[PDB]
Amino acid sequence: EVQLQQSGTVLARPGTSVKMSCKASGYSFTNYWMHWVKQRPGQGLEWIGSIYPGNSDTNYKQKFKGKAKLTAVTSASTAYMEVNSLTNEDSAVYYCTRFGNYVPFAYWGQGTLVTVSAATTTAPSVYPLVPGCSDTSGSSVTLGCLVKGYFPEPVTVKWNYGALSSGVRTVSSVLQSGFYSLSSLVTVPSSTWPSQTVICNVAHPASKTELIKRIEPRIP
Amino acid sequence: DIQMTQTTSSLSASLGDRVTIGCRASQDIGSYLNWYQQKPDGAVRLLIYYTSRLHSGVPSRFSGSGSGTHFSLTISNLEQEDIGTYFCHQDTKPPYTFGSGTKLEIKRADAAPTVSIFPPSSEQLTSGGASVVCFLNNFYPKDINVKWKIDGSERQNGVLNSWTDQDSKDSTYSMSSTLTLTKDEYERHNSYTCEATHKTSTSPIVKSFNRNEC
Ligand SMILES: CO[C@H]1O[C@H](CO[C@H]2O[C@H](CO[C@H]3O[C@H](CO)[C@@H](O)[C@@H]3O[C@@H]3O[C@H](CO)[C@@H](O)[C@@H]3O)[C@@H](O)[C@@H]2O)[C@@H](O)[C@@H]1O
């Protein structure tokens, strides 16, 4: 019923501004306060402010006055937040969330990731993870894809366009020397691979890239 | 403002056990204290509001208590689905404030890792790079050490370690250790070895390959 749909990830240079959106559906947009909450890694949750779309009344944590600006457009059933003078401290996941009635934050957006950086977008390089020339037995093979050298976050990995989900292990991204890397592995019955296309699907929203990597046995 | 302090940043507990997650307020907030659960995909869900009232689809296993300054979320009997990070939230009036969260892990029976090693692909090599991957699969506890040996010599530099989130179904972890080299550096050596030390065994599980192919 109630859904809060937030805009996609954004990369912004320090000193500039970002404006993110939160489209509300399944209830009367103008009759509930919309709140915004900031989540910085290992820094908990911080309340920014709220808006009542019916009359455009706003409140703010003192800190965010003149830093974050809340607006709403009724015809669009959409809440907006514009954050200016961006610093590293502004890199976070931002959530929109609905308050009331007789409950607090009952409904949450999925979050919008903001990366403040002077660095440009870099698509990942993907390399297959293939066992060494026949040296292990034997019923379950582990395959994978190494995802290297991308910026900013996030990357998502899936297998056989999402049809393969059992036995999939995707480790957390790591940051090194300005770039991110991760690896995803899948453990599948020996009769499946190399018999059937085991493909990893690598998506990098910031660069708008959708990559495939076929997992094929090594050259004899 | 009102500072919300959570008792601990992380908690580990066995299935079936009673689990409490605590929160303290810097001033009396009466009953205006809420509990949200956040899953690894970032999804946030209200569990308890107004100190003690359960919200949508929340199991009867959950309850809340509060004195006005000290609060707790209690799980009567821990279940698999309860993995996540739990945050408290006071909403007496603006400005609202939150605790910094408690990450809840399931304590599982000890399980040894299954180890796999991956030589670089021809695709990477032709581009001038060489990554070697050691994969440790389906183990508990999370704590695990991976040692790389190149031509028998320990290598620490250029190694990057990372874990999965705890498995939502069976509570195990997996992790990869990636050793990054140039192709030229890679081709200057023969033996590539990772040794995984885990509390399940006093002896490490060792996986090796030779660049000259066995
Ligand atoms: C049972 O305890 C839970 O119920 C509390 C929420 O109950 C209120 O929800 C209804 C809506 O209230 C919002 O609208 C009111 C009029 O504008 C404002 O008082 C409430 O808005 C919040 O206050 C700030 C404005 O002062 C605004 O930023 C916030 O959205 C109201 O009928 C019920 O009283 C919940 O806190 C307890 O968990």
**Cβ contact (<8 Å) for A128 and B121?**
yes
Q: Which DSSP string corresponds to A135-187? A: -S--SEEEEEEEEEEEBSS--EEEEGGGTB-TTEEEPPPEEETTEEEEEEEEE
CATH code for position A83? 2.60.40.10
Domains within chain B, CATH numbers bracketed:
1-107 (2.60.40.10), 108-211 (2.60.40.10)
Q: Which domain holds residue A43?
A: 1-118
Domain boundary among A93, A118, A143: A118
This entry's atomic model was obtained through X-ray
Residue reference for tokens 């081709």: B187
Q: Are residues A92 and A46 in the same domain?
A: yes
> Of the candidates A137, A134, A142, A139, which has an alpha carbon nearest to the alpha carbon of residue A220?
A134
Paired strand residues for A58 = A51
| Beta-carbon-side half-sphere exposure of residue A144 (alpha carbons within 13 Å) | 31
Q: Are residues A32 and A101 in the same domain?
A: yes
Would strands B102-107 and B10-14 be described as parallel, antiparallel, or unpaired?
parallel
Q: Are residues A17 and A63 in the same domain?
A: yes
Residues 36-65 in A contacting B (C-alpha not used; CB under 8 Å): 37, 43-47, 50, 59, 61-62
Identity of the residue in A46, A110, A146 whose CB atom sits nearest the CB atom of B133: A146
Paired strand residues for A157 = A202
- The verdict on whether omega for the bond into residue A104 sits within 30 degrees of 0, i.e. cis, is no
Q: Are residues A190 and A86 in the same domain?
A: no
Domain boundary among A84, A118, A152: A118
Cβ atoms of A71 and A51 within 8 Å: the answer is yes
Decide: A97 in ligand 1 pocket, CB within 6 A.
Answer: no
Residues 4-33 in A contacting B (C-alpha not used; CB under 8 Å): none
Q: Choose the residue to mutate in A102, A105, A107 for probing ligand 1, maximizing ligand atoms within 8 Å of C-beta.
A: A102
Phi, psi of B16 (to 5 degrees): 95, -20
> Of the candidates B108, B103, B200, which has an alpha carbon nearest to the alpha carbon of residue B145?
B200
Q: Are residues A23 and A37 in the same domain?
A: yes
A191 touches chain B (CB under 8 A): no
Amino acid identity of residue A107, one-letter, is Y
Q: Which two tokens stand for residue A133?
A: 């020339």
Q: Are residues A186 and A81 in the same domain?
A: no
Q: Are residues A42 and A23 in the same domain?
A: yes
Q: Are residues A51 and A153 in the same domain?
A: no
Mutate to test the interface with A, among B2, B24, B162, B172 (most CBs of A within 10 A): B162
Decide: A33 in ligand 1 pocket, CB within 6 A.
Answer: yes
